Amino acid sequence: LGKCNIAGWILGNPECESLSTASSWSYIVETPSSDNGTCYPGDFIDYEELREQLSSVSSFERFEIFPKTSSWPNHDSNKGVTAACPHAGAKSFYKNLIWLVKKGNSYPKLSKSYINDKGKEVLVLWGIHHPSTSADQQSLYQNADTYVFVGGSRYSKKFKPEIAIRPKVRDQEGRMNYYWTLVEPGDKITFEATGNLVVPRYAFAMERNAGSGIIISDTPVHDCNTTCQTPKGAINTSLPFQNIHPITIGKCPKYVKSTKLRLATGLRNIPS
Amino acid sequence: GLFGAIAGFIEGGWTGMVDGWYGYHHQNEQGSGYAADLKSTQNAIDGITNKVNSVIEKMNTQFTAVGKEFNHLEKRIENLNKKVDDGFLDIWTYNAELLVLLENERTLDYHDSNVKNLYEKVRSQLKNNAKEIGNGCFEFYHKCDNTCMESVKNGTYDYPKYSEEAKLNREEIDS
Amino acid sequence: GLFGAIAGFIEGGWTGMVDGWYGYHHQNEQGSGYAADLKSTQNAIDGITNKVNSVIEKMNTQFTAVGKEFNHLEKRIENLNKKVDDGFLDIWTYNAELLVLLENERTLDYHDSNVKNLYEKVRSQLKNNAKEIGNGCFEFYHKCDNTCMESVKNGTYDYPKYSEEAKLNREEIDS
Amino acid sequence: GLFGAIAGFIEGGWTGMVDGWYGYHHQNEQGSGYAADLKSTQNAIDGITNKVNSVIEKMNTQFTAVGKEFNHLEKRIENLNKKVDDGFLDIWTYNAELLVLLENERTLDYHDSNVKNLYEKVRSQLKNNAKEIGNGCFEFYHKCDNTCMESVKNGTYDYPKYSEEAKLNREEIDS
Ligand SMILES: *[C@@H]1O[C@H](CO)[C@@H](O[C@@H]2O[C@H](CO)[C@@H](O[C@@H]3O[C@H](CO)[C@@H](O)[C@H](O)[C@@H]3O)[C@H](O)[C@H]2NC(C)=O)[C@H](O)[C@H]1NC(C)=O
Ligand SMILES: *[C@@H]1O[C@H](CO)[C@@H](O)[C@H](O)[C@H]1NC(C)=O
């Protein structure tokens, strides 16, 4: 991910690359200075759980679950940009989400559904916006008392915006909370809102593996294979013990604090 | 040493013998030189090879990712994770250190035992036809040519064939 | 073998001796047969029994339920649980495998040592009253009846009682 | 005993010898008395001292408060805490009991071994210059004054110096 962490990559932070082709990976590498993530301040719900679920995938295809040009005829899908997420000096937003605002002076009740016909699990992410002031609520959504509802065959949660002035983070006194769910094949996910909903635009069809992990390291990536990986580097050995790094991924020797494990095979050496 | 041969009544090793771990030096009218007892060496090399492979190959691990990530309100489970990683680290480190210490001692005793048995096999073959002159050396009371030397190394030394000549020479020497 | 007796200078075992682990074959004017040295056998059987019980009974576990259940938003602690079960599995498997490997070797060396000490106890008793004819056998220079045979097995062989007769027969035989 | 000396062919201990664990009684024309072999005693005292310190000092604990407090709606974790305290209690009690049982047996065998080696060191020194009269006692075939006695205890007994006189006296005694 380089410049970005998993949050920025999976949301579409403007400073992050995007995967167009269907891809797969055996594990995930962040650098210790990967500090991009959620450029609009807030909480990413169950972030650590999502990172574990994404550590390794057999298949991964991004698709436009709610196409931008046709899904929101009665709402404005172009003004939802912010200076908290700049792109080339101009206001922007996450690539995978659309910050819907009122069209003119009307924000009608929103109702959009998707049925998973991809044959695999679909990762859907969305955000809830909590403005700083009642003025800010009405300037964006026109309605004062709003709710968001997201429902699936297994997920059901109702969101209520919480309006108050928070200390400025990236020049934002409001906050935005980020949510995710996995939609099983053949299931429907329903979105309903009278405001404050940061809708999905791109979702991810994926197949999870047996979980790998995440390595946070500055070590470069090369075209070597290996069967045991550490943040310092890869390990090619049949020996049962190693002292390079306790945190490893793969079929690895046990980690020990030993500096030397020399096993005698020959005789006591007594020349002359 | 546990068996008394290596660094014991055989004081030192032979840099001149290069083809084996345990062997012979011989000297007769046809010349002298070093030779290695192939059977005892190959048996010991097979044994030690099996020992090293046993220590290595009995460790069969599966695919695993040790790392775990916890947020700032998950300190207790983070510490629980640390205790697991630390406890496994302590168990493996201590066991690995002692296994090498103990088995290295067993390995050197093994070589010591192999040398003693080799010396004793010859001594039980020659009996009074040769004298035990120390340092693992036998001085014959009868001439032992290259063929006779190989019979001793092959465990086929014919004691009655030379017993009379050795007896006469032994009594003359002792007189 | 580490001590040279089993599969060594005593080449093979006796299917004919069925009542013990280590024993004797004898032959005198009264007949022949196999007998087992009860003291050395019972001591070894007590020793090995204690060894097996030590390996088994030192494992004393309590009541425990290994299983744990986690929901779909608890993958990290689920994997932490798996790491604990896997780490214990790796530690116990490797330790169990090496314990059996190492202690099996010690057990066979133990039997080898017990045989060597039994042979040496007799040899130190008979001294020159008998000849060491190989394969763990002693050929007497004096007649040794059933009572005399039992004295050797009982560790009460009276060397001076027969020393003169053996000396005369030994010198006559060697002459 | 495992080595046969203590409570074996040396039937009892000496209250008269008070300065050491293993030693000598002597009697010559200059008198008699008890003396202790300082080297073997100090080596054994160093060995046992190291054994006791090893058992004690390898236990290095940190600061810890065992107690825990739970309210009436925390019975499950209270019982989990009890299982931890009980399991540690069972492990330490059983291990402590067996460690003392097993190492006490090793300690008495150690003393038995030290006595046997001391007896054998003397026997291998005197050879036929003295008679083995049982109970760990040697009766000399030549006069052995205080200086000669100290040489035996010092491991510097000059066998050839007295061999001729002992041989003449031995043959006269046996005749
Ligand atoms: C992606 O990551 C980089 C950092 O790796 C972000 O750039 C950082 O943006 C913050 C914005 O708050 C800068 O801090 C602010 O700087 C100004 C001027 O110095 C000051 O008034 C503020 O109090 C605060 O310190 C920070 O300097 C800047 N870092 C760098 C290295 O340029 C970037 O915004 C991220 N972009 C996205 C879209 O996530
Ligand atoms: C790694 O293994 C894969 C699969 O066999 C192969 O395509 C690739 O060339 C290998 N890479 C190296 C560097 O050996």
DSSP code string of B45-69:
HHHHHHHHHHHHHT-----EE----
Give the max Cα distance, chain D. 97
A210: nearest CA partner in chain C: C79
Closest among A110, A116, A43 to A72, alpha carbons compared? A110
Q: Say how many Å lie between the CA of residue A225 and the centre of ligand 2.
A: 6
3-state secondary structure of A270: coil
Q: Are B168 and B175 in contact (CB under 8 A)?
A: no
Q: How many CB pairs under 8 A join A and C?
A: 14
C76 with A52: Cβ contact below 8 A: yes
Question: Rounded to the nearest 10 degrees, how much is the dihedral formed by the CA atoms of B87, B88, B91, B93?
Answer: -110
Q: How far apart are CA C173 and CA C141, in angstroms?
A: 9
User: Would you say the CB of residue A4 lies under 6 angstroms from ligand 1?
Assistant: no
**Separation between Cα atoms, residue A109 and residue A104, nearest integer Å:** 15
Contact C62 D90 (CB under 8 A): yes
For residue D68, what are its two tokens? 């825990």
- H runs (alpha helix) in chain D: 38-57, 75-126, 146-153, 159-174
Resolution in A: 2.4
Two tokens, residue D13: 């201990």
- The answer to whether D91 contacts C58, with C-beta atoms less than 8 Å apart, is no
Q: Is D145 exposed, middle or buried (0-12, 13-18, 19+ CB in 10 A)?
A: exposed
Q: Is B25 left (phi over 0), alpha (psi -120 to 50) or beta?
A: beta
C-alpha torsion angle, residues B113, B118, B119, B125 (rounded to 10):
140
A with C: 3 or more CB pairs under 8 Å? Answer: yes
Q: What angle do the packed helices D146-153 and D75-126 form, to 10 degrees?
A: 140
Helical spans, DSSP H, in chain A: 6-11, 47-53, 134-141
B100 in contact with A, Cβ within 8 Å: yes
C11 vs C135: CA distance, rounded Å? 6
A225 lines ligand 2 (CB under 6 A): yes
Rounded to whole angstroms, the Cα distance separating D74 from A67 reads: 52
In the numeric block, the tokens 């068996």 are attached to: B3
CA-to-CA distance for B11 and B137, rounded, in angstroms?
Answer: 11
- Contact of C34 with C124, CB cutoff 8 Å: no
> Of ligand 2's atoms, which has the minimum distance to the CA of residue A223?
13
Classify burial at C147, counting beta carbons within 10 Å of its beta carbon; exposed 0-12, middle 13-18, buried 19 or more: exposed
CB–CB of A190/A66 below 8 Å? Answer: no
Residue type, B10: I
Strand, coil or helix: what is B83?
helix
Ligand 2 neighbour A265 (Cβ under 6 A):
no
Question: Cα–Cα distance between D135 and D125 in angstroms, integer?
Answer: 18
Torsion angle in degrees (nearest 10) through CA of B26, B31, B33, B36: -60
Alpha-carbon span B63 to A227, nearest angstrom: 9
Of A48, A240, A254, the CB nearest to C76: A48
- Which residues of chain D make contact with C58, given a CB cutoff of 8 A? 94, 98
Give backbone dihedrals phi and psi of C52, rounded to 5 degrees, phi first. Answer: -65, -45
Tokens of A231: 């943040």
Inter-residue contact C166 to C140 (CB < 8 Å): yes
Say which residues have a Cβ less than 8 Å from residue A84's Cβ, sequence separation at least 6.
Answer: A39, A40, A41, A170, A171, A172
Q: Counting ligands in written order, which one lies closest to the CA of residue A9?
A: 1
Asked if C62 and D87 come within 8 Å (Cβ–Cβ), the reply is: yes
Q: Probe ligand 2: pick from A26, A223, A225, max atoms within 8 Å of CB?
A: A225
- Determine whether the interchain pair B117/C4 forms a contact, defined as Cβ–Cβ distance below 8 Å: yes
How many Cα atoms occupy the beta-carbon half-sphere of B18 within 13 Å? 1
Task: Write out the DSSP string of A107-128.
Answer: -PPEEEEEE--SSSEEEEEEEE
CB-based burial label for A146 (10 Å; 0-12, 13-18, 19+): buried
Beta-bridged to residue A200, according to DSSP, are: A97
Q: What's the CA gap between A247 and B85, in Å, rounded?
A: 9
Give the CA angle between residues A85, A86, A91 to the nearest 5°: 95
User: What are the backbone dihedrals phi and psi of residue C6, each rounded to the nearest 5 degrees, phi first?
Assistant: -70, 135
Q: Which chain C residues have any C-beta within 8 angstroms of a chain D C-beta? A: 58, 60, 62
Domains of chain B by residue range:
23-170
CA of A237 relative to ligand 2 center, distance in Å: 17
Q: Which two tokens stand for residue D70?
A: 């739970």
Ligand closest to A13 (CA) is 1
**Distance (Å, rounded) from C-alpha D92 to C-alpha D84?**
12
Asked if C90 lies within 8 A of B54 by C-beta distance, the reply is no
Shortest CA distance from A239: residue in chain B: B56
Structure tokens at B172: 């003359």
Closest by Cβ to B6, choosing from A27, A215, A267:
A267
- For a ligand 1 pocket test, name from A13, A16, A39 the mutation site with the most ligand atoms within 8 angstroms of its C-beta: A39
Other residues' Cβ atoms within 10 Å of the Cβ of residue B96:
18
Sequence-distant (6+) residues with CB within 8 A of C140 are C126, C129, C130, C131, C166
Asked whether at least 3 C-beta pairs link A and D within 8 Å, the reply is no
Closest-CA residue of D relative to C47 is D2
**What is the CATH number that goes with domain C23-170?**
3.90.20.10
Handedness of CA B76, B78, B80, B86 (dihedral sign): negative
Cα A98 to averaged position of ligand 1 atoms, centre (Å):
23
The encoded tokens of residue A28 equal: 């995930």
A61-99: b (≥16 Cβ within 10 Å) or e? bbeebbeeeebbeebbbeebbbebbbeeeeebbbbbbbb
Put simply, the answer to whether B70 touches C76 (Cβ < 8 Å) is yes
| Pocket of ligand 1 contains residue A170 by CB under 6 Å | yes
- Residues A57, A25 contacting (CB under 8 angstroms): yes
**Residue numbers after which chain C breaks, C to N beyond 2.5 angstroms:** none
Chain Cα centroid distance, residue A78: 23
The residue whose CB lies within 8 Å of the most ligand 1 atoms, and thus the one to mutate among A4, A11, A15, A172, is A15
**Ligand 2 centroid distance, CA of A246 (Å):** 26
Nearest CA to ligand 1 atom 23: A170
With beta carbons less than 8 A apart as the criterion, state whether A272 and A252 touch.
no
Q: What kind of experiment solved this structure? A: X-ray
Integer-rounded Cα Rg, in Å, for chain C is: 27
d(CA A166, CA A137): 15
Report CB contact under 8 Å: A52, C75.
Answer: yes
Residues in chain A, total:
272
Provide the shortest C-alpha distance from residue C30 to chain D (in Å): 33
Could you say which residues from 36 to 65 on chain A have a Cβ atom under 8 Å away from some Cβ of chain C? 46, 48-49, 52-53
Residue type (1 letter), C7: A
Name chain A contacts of C76, Cβ cutoff 8 Å: 48-49, 52
Spatial CB neighbours of D147, under 8 Å, sequence gap ≥ 6: none
User: What is the A224 CA–ligand 2 centroid distance (Å)?
Assistant: 8
Distance (Å, rounded) from C-alpha D125 to C-alpha D129?
9
Alpha-carbon span A86 to A13, nearest angstrom: 9
